[PDB]
Amino acid sequence: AGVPCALVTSCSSVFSGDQLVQHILGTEDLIVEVTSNDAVRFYPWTIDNKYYSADINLCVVPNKFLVTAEIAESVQAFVVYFDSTQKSGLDSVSSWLPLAKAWLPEVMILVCDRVSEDGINRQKAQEWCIKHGFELVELSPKSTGVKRIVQALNANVWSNVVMK
Amino acid sequence: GVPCALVTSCSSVFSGDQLVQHILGTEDLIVEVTSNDAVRFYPWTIDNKYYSADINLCVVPNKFLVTAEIAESVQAFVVYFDSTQKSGLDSVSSWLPLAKAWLPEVMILVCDRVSEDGINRQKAQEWCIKHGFELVELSPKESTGVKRIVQALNANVWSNVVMK
């Protein structure tokens, strides 16, 4: 098979999975151009740390109707952005839950910019994460943020790790 | 690791990046660039009747930028030269030790078209015989050109092919 996916997506029309991929790859000063006519976009990334190295793809899949059999079989992590300023912010993730149950990825991250008392506050985000098996991450909290996403992905045992 | 098809150029007339745009048939490409805006990695999923393989087209402007990881991954080599100049083939000499050391099955010397006032067909062919390259003309007078490059790359046994 091919290399693993970390599937990256967004439930907001005003922040894309591609932009989140740019922040993640930015942790190592990698600049990415995201303009492809392909409906799904794969960005290669060599995870390298003191334990192992692993080639993966950050797979930007804008909606569930773009999940092929091949993509589904490769998903080993799931990162999903939601708009916590909207009261419907968690409801907007609901369409991904059947797929997340099927994939059973060992890293599942729910990402917002900052929890919000008139939108989705910390308590409600945390209860959702308990029920569905996600970790809550804030990109701009009042490790955390994109560094925590990178940390969590570096602590994943990918199917193709090469141990040091 | 993920294979590289290393694409480069010895002439400012036509850069490795332009060569990739022509090989992939579009300018709208996902591309990962390093902090120094020098080595460009273009992901590409080859898919044919025999296999599917997700590789990188790696535009490496000069031999100094061939890291250990790039060197390890090179499984095809494509280099443009300016055939209108009598010194056109001399401009490629820098790459010969590395191409000798990588052992790629695809080694392609590319020009727009051979020229009797620069590097003509005989001299280009004699150079290709001595160093084990294949001569390709993008714009011949008479597969050829970019279609032949794509054919050769699809007939290469990458280290990560997924057989159909």
Side-chain angles (χ1 to χ4, degrees):
Chain A
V3 299
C5 287
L7 197 149
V8 183
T9 193
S10 171
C11 293
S12 176
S13 70
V14 294
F15 186 74
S16 71
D18 303 280
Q19 289 169 285
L20 186 52
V21 160
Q22 293 179 306
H23 298 296
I24 292 153
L25 284 190
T27 65
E28 36 184 78
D29 311 294
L30 258 180
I31 304 300
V32 209
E33 309 191 42
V34 299
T35 67
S36 165
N37 295 329
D38 290 350
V40 164
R41 296 161 296 270
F42 281 28
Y43 305 87
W45 183 36
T46 298
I47 296 169
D48 177 86
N49 53 57
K50 83 181 173 200
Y51 301 110
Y52 65 80
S53 59
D55 311 311
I56 73 160
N57 282 315
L58 292 174
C59 307
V60 175
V61 180
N63 62 74
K64 59 155 173 146
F65 310 106
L66 287 167
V67 175
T68 65
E70 199 182 327
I71 289 172
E73 187 38 47
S74 77
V75 171
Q76 295 180 22
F78 182 40
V79 186
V80 61
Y81 173 95
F82 83 106
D83 184 347
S84 51
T85 74
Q86 294 281 340
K87 288 159 199 303
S88 61
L90 288 174
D91 292 334
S92 69
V93 192
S94 70
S95 53
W96 289 101
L97 299 176
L99 289 85
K101 302 199 199 173
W103 301 331
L104 289 172
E106 251 274 285
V107 163
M108 298 207 288
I109 302 168
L110 181 75
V111 176
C112 64
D113 295 302
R114 183 182 286 176
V115 295
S116 160
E117 288 287 342
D118 290 331
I120 309 298
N121 64 18
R122 190 172 312 277
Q123 185 81 18
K124 294 302 181 133
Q126 285 178 318
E127 294 174 358
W128 188 98
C129 283
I130 293 167
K131 170 158 172 53
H132 303 112
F134 285 66
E135 177 181 349
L136 174 71
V137 165
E138 288 174 279
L139 293 179
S140 297
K142 177 191 179 128
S143 58
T144 59
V146 67
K147 271 161 177 192
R148 176 54 198 153
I149 298 170
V150 175
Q151 203 178 39
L153 292 176
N154 272 262
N156 197 21
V157 186
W158 310 96
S159 63
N160 66 334
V161 293
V162 167
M163 298 278 186
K164 302 191 166 160
Chain B
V2 178
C4 273
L6 190 154
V7 180
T8 194
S9 169
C10 296
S11 170
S12 63
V13 167
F14 196 85
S15 76
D17 305 285
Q18 295 174 285
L19 200 45
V20 167
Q21 290 185 331
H22 278 84
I23 290 159
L24 295 188
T26 176
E27 308 167 55
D28 287 336
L29 296 171
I30 279 160
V31 52
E32 290 180 6
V33 209
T34 180
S35 148
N36 302 295
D37 289 339
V39 177
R40 304 243 266 163
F41 296 86
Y42 297 80
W44 182 37
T45 298
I46 305 184
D47 184 272
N48 55 54
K49 72 200 220 156
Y50 294 107
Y51 65 83
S52 79
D54 177 3
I55 65 168
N56 287 324
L57 295 172
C58 311
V59 180
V60 185
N62 61 75
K63 62 108 172 166
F64 290 102
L65 289 164
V66 183
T67 63
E69 297 86 353
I70 298 160
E72 271 151 6
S73 67
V74 180
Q75 287 168 37
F77 180 50
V78 181
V79 62
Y80 180 90
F81 76 110
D82 186 355
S83 46
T84 73
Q85 299 176 341
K86 279 164 190 339
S87 75
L89 296 170
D90 289 346
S91 71
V92 193
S93 64
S94 188
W95 290 98
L96 297 178
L98 297 91
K100 191 86 199 323
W102 305 315
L103 292 191
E105 177 60 44
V106 171
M107 287 216 292
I108 294 170
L109 179 78
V110 191
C111 61
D112 293 308
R113 72 164 54 172
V114 298
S115 163
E116 275 294 341
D117 306 314
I119 310 296
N120 65 2
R121 192 169 308 271
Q122 193 196 15
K123 288 323 197 96
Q125 273 169 345
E126 295 179 4
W127 188 99
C128 288
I129 293 159
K130 296 184 242 174
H131 314 277
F133 282 65
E134 174 185 350
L135 178 59
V136 164
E137 301 181 274
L138 298 170
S139 311
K141 183 151 172 133
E142 193 276 332
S143 295
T144 69
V146 65
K147 274 174 208 203
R148 168 64 194 141
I149 298 170
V150 176
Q151 173 177 76
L153 293 167
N154 275 259
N156 200 22
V157 185
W158 309 97
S159 60
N160 68 340
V161 289
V162 182
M163 311 294 186
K164 290 185 180 181

